[PDB]
Amino acid sequence: MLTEGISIQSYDGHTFGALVGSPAKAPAPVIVIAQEIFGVNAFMRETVSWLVDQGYAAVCPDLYARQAPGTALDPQDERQREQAYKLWQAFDMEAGVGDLEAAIRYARHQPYSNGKVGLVGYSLGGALAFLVAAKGYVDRAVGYYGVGLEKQLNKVPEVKHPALFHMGGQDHFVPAPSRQLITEGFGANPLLQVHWYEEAGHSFARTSSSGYVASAAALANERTLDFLAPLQS
Numbered sequence: 381m382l383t384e385g386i387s388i389q390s391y392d393g394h395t396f397g398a399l400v401g402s403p404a405k406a407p408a409p410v411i412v413i414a415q416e417i418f419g420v421n422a423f424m425r426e427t428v429s430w431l432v433d434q435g436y437a438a439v440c441p442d443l444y445a446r447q448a449p450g451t452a453l454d455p456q457d458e459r460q461r462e463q464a465y466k467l468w469q470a471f472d473m474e475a476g477v478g479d480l481e482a483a484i485r486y487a488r489h490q491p492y493s494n495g496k497v498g499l500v501g502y503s504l505g506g507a508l509a510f511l512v513a514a515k516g517y518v519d520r521a522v523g524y525y526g527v528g529l530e531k532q533l534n535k536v537p538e539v540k541h542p543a544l545f546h547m548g549g550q551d552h553f554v555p556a557p558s559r560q561l562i563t564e565g566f567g568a569n570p571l572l573q574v575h576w577y578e579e580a581g582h583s584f585a586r587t588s589s590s591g592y593v594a595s596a597a598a599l600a601n602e603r604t605l606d607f608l609a610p611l612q613s
Contacts, residue, residue, distance in 0.1 A: 381425055381452060382442055390475075390482040396445035398483065401428040403437040407494035409611035410487035412518070413440040414480060414505025416583070417468040418460075419451030423586050427500070434605055435612055437492050441483040443476055443504075456588060468504060476504075477511045484517045496611040500604060503527070503583065506545070510535070513543035513572075519611055520544070522604050525551055525582050530558040533565035536572065544573045544607045546600040548580035548591070575603065 382397040389395050399420050411431050415424055420440050428438040444451040444467050451467065453460040480499065487497045499521045501509035506526030513521040514535040521543040523529075529545070547554060547562070554562075559576065566572045580596035583589035587597075 382420060382450065388441060388479075388482050388486045391478045392475075394446060394475075394479070396479060397442045397449065398486075399424060399428055399438075399440040401432040401438045402492050403432060404435065406437075406492040407613060408435060408437050408492055409496040409498060409519075409608070409613075410437045410439060410490065410493050411498045411500055411608065412480060412483045412487050413438055414499060414501030414508045414512075415440065415443055416455075416503040416505060416586075417464045418453040418455050419444050419464075419467075421452040421454065423455075423502075423588065427502075431500075436498075436608070437487075437490070439483055439487050441479055443479055443508075444471070446472065446475060446479075455586075471504065473508070473511065476508050477515065480508060480512055481515070481517050484512075494611075494613050498522070498608050498611055500524075500608075501526070502585065507532075509543065510545070513541065514538040516540045520608060522546075522607060524585055524600065525553075527553045530554075530561045530565075533561060536565050536569050539569055539571050542571050542573075542607070544604065545575070546585075546603070547574060547576050548582055548584050548593075548596070549576050549578040550581040553582060573607075575600065 383400040502524045506523030509523030577596040580593040585597040
């Protein structure tokens with residue numbers, strides 16, 4: 381689902397939609413939410429709702445719009461999961477970061493904005509949150525279980541604003557040696573935080589996942605909220 385009429389123009393002229401939630405009371409900081417591999421779907425709407433309840437506005441851009449506008453896949457449906465994986469494999473990460481940059485600029489100057497912008501991303505969006513943190517586009521970035529973070533550690537010294545990452549200890553994407561590389565690499569830059577949740581794997585913060593873990597979700601989420609709170613007026 382997207383908010384009808386919302387259109388955001390990217391660097392290269394590509395335009396895309398977004399799901400927007402205006403804040404309960406304005407002005408407010410705006411959080412750009414970077415999707416999982418399933419487009420802008422129920423978990424994205426739930427996350428917009430949550431952040432609005434917590435005193436934010438939120439913008440969730442349609443990052444698959446370069447491939448197919450309006451993708452919103454049910455992660456419990458096998459055939460739709462297959463299409464999600466195909467879209468993820470074809471996904472242009474750099475163009476993703478560019479679209480997020482354009483969403484962040486949009487978020488800065490909406491009527492309801494206090495001018496501060498955060499980013500929270502999950503899975504694919506967690507990977508994108510690290511790349512965005514290296515570019516420095518946002519005031520604060522948060523990633524949940526990005527894939528391949530161990531391959532991006534050359535970017536650690538580029539990070540100039542705070543970023544927070546929540547990783548599942550049982551995430552099959554992240555074997556022990558990768559966790560060690562990430563831990564050591566991140567430790568070099570105190571603007572980065574990474575927490576490991578020993579009893580949780582991928583997708584642990586999404587209730588509809590077979591990998592949902594309520595205790596890990598709740599602790600990660602309260603950490604995210606405490607980390608974003610300084611953006612609030």
